Design a protein around this ligand. Structure first.
Ligand code: HEM
Ligand SMILES: N[C@@H](Cc1c[nH]c2ccccc12)C(=O)O
Length: 403
C-alpha cells in the first residue's frame, strides 16, 4: 500500500520519493485511482508522450468524487473541454493562440518593469522596527495578489469575490485524502467564476488596469477567428483559478525557507548576477508547488516495468522528478550555481508548459532581489508549518527573523 497516500509525508516528501523512485518507480496508488510516476526520465517523457492525453476530466473526477459523475452539458465538462489545460491538439493550439496577446515579448517587457516595482514596494513596506514576520501571509501570499492586480489586471475591488471562490475550487486538488468540500459547492463556485469573467469583460464588474494581461486579452476579442466567446470565458475562469492558487505563494515561501536555511546561498545571490538569474529556476526545482499532475493513457504504454492500459490514470510526480539524483546531482542541495536548474518540471513541459512561466519567473526574481538586498540575514524564528495537501503543496506559516 502506497506511502504516497500517507499524510505524514507532506512536510518532507523527498526521502519517500527517493526511496520509491528507486524501488517502485511506477506503482499503483489506490486513493488516486492512478499509477504514480516518480523518476525524472519517466515524468519528462510522460509530459511529452502523445500516448498520454490531457483530456482527463472524466477520469480525475471519477478518482476524486467516485459515484458522482456529471453529464456533458455540466459546467465541469464544458469548462474542462474548452480550456488549454485539459485539451489535446488541435483544439489546444487554437485555444492557446487565442490568449497570445496577453503574453507577447512586448507584454513581458512591460510586466518585467511592473513586477520589479510591485516587489520593491512590498518589501519596502516592511517597517524598520520589524525583526519578526510570518512570511506566508505577509509576503508569499501577498505578492501574487499584488501581481494579479498590477500585471494581470484583476480589479482590486473584485478580490473579495475571487479569492474565497478560488480557495474553495482549489479543494478539488487536495491529493489522496477525503474531499473537504462537496462537489455541488465546487460547481457553484466554478459557475460563479464564469459569470464574473463574462460580466468583467462586459464592464459590469471592476475596472481592469491598462496594459495588463486581462486588458490585452479584452482588446484581442474582436479579432479572434477560431474560438468562441464562451471559450474566452472558460479560459478566463482557468486564469483566475491559476492566479489565486497556492502555487505562486508556495514557490515564494519555500524559496524564502531555502534561503533562510542556506545563508551561503544568500551570499552567492549577492555576489554573482548569474546566481540571481538562476534563482527562480532553482527555487522552482527545489519545491514544485504542484507536486503531481494528472494524465490518462490514450493508448497502452510501458513505464517502469509496468504495462499501463489505455484508459488508466497516471499521476506524474513533478516534485519527485525535480529531486531525482540521476538528473540533479546532490538534489537536496539548494544551489544557485547548479548548471541545469532550468530543466525542472515545476511548470510542466511541452504542449501544456505553464502559460505564465516567464511572468512567474519575473515575480520570483524580483521578490528575492528586493528581499535579500534589504534583509540578507533572514533566518527561521520557529517551525515552518505545511498545509495538509500533497497535490498543491505550500507552507501555511513561515516564522522568520529578518535581522
Ligand atoms: C508558481 C506558480 C505556478 C506553477 C508552479 C504552475 C505550474 C503549472 C504546471 C505544472 C502546468 C502544467 C500542468 C500539466 O501539463 O499537467 C501549468 C500549466 C498552466 N499554467 Fe501554470 N503555474 C503557475 C502559475 C500560473 C499562473 C499565475 C497562471 C495564470 C495565467 C498559470 C496558467 C497556466 C495555464 C493556462 C496552463 C495551461 C497551459 C496549456 O495547457 O497550454 N500558471 N502550470
Ligand atoms: N495539475 C492540474 C493542472 C494544473 C497545473 N497548474 C494548476 C493551477 C491551478 C489549477 C490546476 C493546475 C491537473 O492535473 O489538473
Amino acid at each position: 500500500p502506497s506511502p504516497l497516500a500517507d499524510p505524514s509525508i507532506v512536510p518532507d516528501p523527498y526521502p519517500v520519493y527517493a526511496d520509491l523512485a528507486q524501488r517502485r518507480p511506477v506503482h499503483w496508488v489506490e486513493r488516486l485511482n492512478a499509477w504514480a510516476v516518480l523518476t525524472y526520465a519517466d515524468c519528462a517523457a510522460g509530459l511529452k508522450d502523445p500516448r498520454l492525453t490531457a483530456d482527463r476530466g472524466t477520469e480525475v473526477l471519477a478518482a476524486k468524487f467516485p459515484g458522482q459523475p456529471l453529464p456533458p452539458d455540466n459546467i465541469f465538462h464544458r469548462w474542462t473541454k474548452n480550456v488549454v489545460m485539459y485539451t489535446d491538439p488541435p483544439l489546444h493550439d487554437a485555444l492557446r493562440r487565442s490568449v497570445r496577446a496577453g503574453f507577447t515579448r512586448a507584454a513581458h517587457q512591460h510586466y518585467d518593469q511592473v513586477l520589479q516595482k510591485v516587489a520593491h514596494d512590498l518589501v519596502a513596506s516592511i517597517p524598520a522596527g520589524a525583526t519578526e514576520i510570518d512570511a506566508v501571509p505577509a509576503l508569499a501570499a501577498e505578492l501574487p495578489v499584488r501581481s494579479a492586480v498590477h500585471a494581470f489586471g484583476v480589479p482590486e475591488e473584485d478580490l473579495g469575490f475571487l479569492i474565497p471562490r478560488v480557495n474553495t475550487i482549489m479543494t478539488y486538488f487536495s491529493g489522496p485524502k477525503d474531499q473537504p468540500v462537496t462537489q455541488e459547492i465546487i460547481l457553484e463556485k466554478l459557475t460563479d467564476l464564469h459569470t464574473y469573467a463574462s460580466e468583467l469583460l462586459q464592464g459590469m464588474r471592476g475596472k481592469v488596469l491598462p496594459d495588463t494581461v486581462i486588458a490585452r486579452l479584452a482588446a484581442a476579442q474582436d479579432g479572434l477567428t477560431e474560438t468562441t466567446p464562451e471559450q474566452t470565458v472558460h479560459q478566463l475562469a482557468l486564469v483566475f483559478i491559476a492566479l489565486f492558487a497556492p502555487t505562486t505563494p508556495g514557490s515564494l515561501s519555500s524559496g524564502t525557507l531555502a534561503f533562510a536555511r542556506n545563508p551561503r546561498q544568500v551570499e552567492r545571490f549577492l555576489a554573482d548576477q548569474a546566481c540571481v538569474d538562476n534563482t527562480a529556476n532553482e527555487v522552482l526545482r527545489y519545491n514544485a508547488s504542484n507536486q503531481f499532475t494528472w494524465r490518462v493513457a490514450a493508448k497502452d504504454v510501458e513505464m517502469g516495468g509496468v504495462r499501463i492500459e489505455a484508459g488508466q490514470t497516471l499521476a506524474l510526480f513533478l516534485g519527485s522528478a525535480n529531486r531525482d539524483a540521476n538528473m540533479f546531482e546532490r538534489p537536496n542541495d539548494f544551489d544557485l550555481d547548479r548548471p541545469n536548474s532550468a530543466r525542472h518540471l515545476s511548470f510542466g513541459q511541452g504542449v501544456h508548459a505553464c502559460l505564465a512561466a516567464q511572468l512567474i519567473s519575473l515575480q520570483l526574481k524580483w521578490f528575492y532581489v528586493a528581499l535579500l538586498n534589504r534583509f540578507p540575514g533572514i533566518r527561521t524564528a520557529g517551525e515552518p508549518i505545511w498545509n495538509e495537501n500533497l497535490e498543491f503543496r505550500s507552507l501555511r506559516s513561515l516564522p522568520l527573523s529578518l535581522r
